[PDB]
């Protein structure tokens, strides 16, 4: 199907760019939102009884401000999220009242019955603490990751290496049109491989999410022309992200990304991509692209020293 193909391409494109109001208006009922529609809007090219989305489904339709808050809780890392919470709390005591939360959520109302029942009681009184806040953070992130995992049809509770590589390359919204060839080659490169159990990809995704600190943690490798390595990646993931990584996952990431290199995975190869994609918070599809391409080409050409 060609027409449905271009429809899904345009939906994915409007998902990638111009998110805040255009997406929320693009998915609705009949001005509010529904949880399954939210899940549809957060997944590209596309009732629970145990999920968070079930709890919201029991609750009333989601608001636009709630949508913004959900985007931020999905986006920001853990430490920055703790800082954001500390900024949420206006009063001294470490508990966000319903009134101050209402103020800092109404501050987003620019185009001029919420998730409160999950944070507060039906009386809209029960104030929460930082512990419940981080618990909701972790629960929502693990839940969306579980949903994405199960969307890829698993075998024996496991996922082909090509599928994991495709999910990874889809996480960083970069269309190199050449890394897809590496994704395709990963299958034969890992002929009759393992199944990449959910815990391995979970650990790798939490590590990738906590990369803003990983970058500054290995800053000595930068400023020295150094390049990454298997053991060093193991170490930095164990120290900063505080989680283990199986050697197979590091192997498949190396095989996916270290294309120009010979197994070293320098800054421009892997870390820069994720560090830039984590900062998404800041025919027309030809001008800017061609300009950037030409700029890079001219820079590479002029790269002939003094």
């Amino acid at each position: 199907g060609f027409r449905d193909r271009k429809v899904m391409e345009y939906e994915n494109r409007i998902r990638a760019y111009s998110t805040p109001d255009k997406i929320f208006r693009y998915f609705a009922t009949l001005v509010f939102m529904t949880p399954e529609d939210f899940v549809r809007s957060i997944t590209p090219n596309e009732a629970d009884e145990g999920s968070i989305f079930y709890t919201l489904g029991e609750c009333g339709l989601i608001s636009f401000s709630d949508y913004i808050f959900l985007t931020t809780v999905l986006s920001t890392p853990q430490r920055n999220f703790e800082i954001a919470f500390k900024m949420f709390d206006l009063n001294g005591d470490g508990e966000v009242d319903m009134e101050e939360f209402e103020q800092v959520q109404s501050i987003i109302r620019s185009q001029t019955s919420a998730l409160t029942t999950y944070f507060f009681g039906a009386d809209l009184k029960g104030k929460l603490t930082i512990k419940n806040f981080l618990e909701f953070q972790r629960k929502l992130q693990h839940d969306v990751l579980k949903l994405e995992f199960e969307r890829h049809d698993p075998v024996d509770g496991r996922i082909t290496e090509r599928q994991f590589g495709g999910m990874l390359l889809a996480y960083s919204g970069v269309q190199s049109k050449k890394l897809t060839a590496m994704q395709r080659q990963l299958k034969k490169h890992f002929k009759e491989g393992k199944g990449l159990t959910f815990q391995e990809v979970e650990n790798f995704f939490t590590f990738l999410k906590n990369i803003n600190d990983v970058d500054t943690a290995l800053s000595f490798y930068h400023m020295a022309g150094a390049s990454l390595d298997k053991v060093t990646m193991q170490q930095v993931a164990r120290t900063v992200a505080k989680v283990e990584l199986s050697d197979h996952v590091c192997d498949v990431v190396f095989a996916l990304f270290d294309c120009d290199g010979n197994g070293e995975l320098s800054n421009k190869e892997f870390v820069s991509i994720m560090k830039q994609r984590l900062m998404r918070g800041l025919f027309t599809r030809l001008m800017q692209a061609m300009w950037k391409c030409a700029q890079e080409t001219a820079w590479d050409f002029a790269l002939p020293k003094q």
Binding site: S176, K177, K178, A181, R184, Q185, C293, T297
Partner: protein
């Protein structure tokens, strides 16, 4: 035709000196130049991550 209005014969046709040499001395080098151009263009298309055959 081979004869004029009378029975006279037309002159010998002019033949270029060293014809095949002057032809094959300009065909082959440009085949090589075209090969080089195509190779470099394919390399550059693969460099800009535009067209990668697989």
């Amino acid at each position: 035709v081979i004869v004029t209005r009378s029975g006279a014969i037309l002159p010998k046709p002019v033949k270029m000196s060293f014809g095949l040499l002057r032809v094959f001395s300009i065909v082959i080098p440009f085949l090589y130049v075209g090969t080089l151009i195509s190779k470099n263009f394919a390399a550059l298309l693969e460099e800009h991550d535009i067209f990668v055959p697989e």
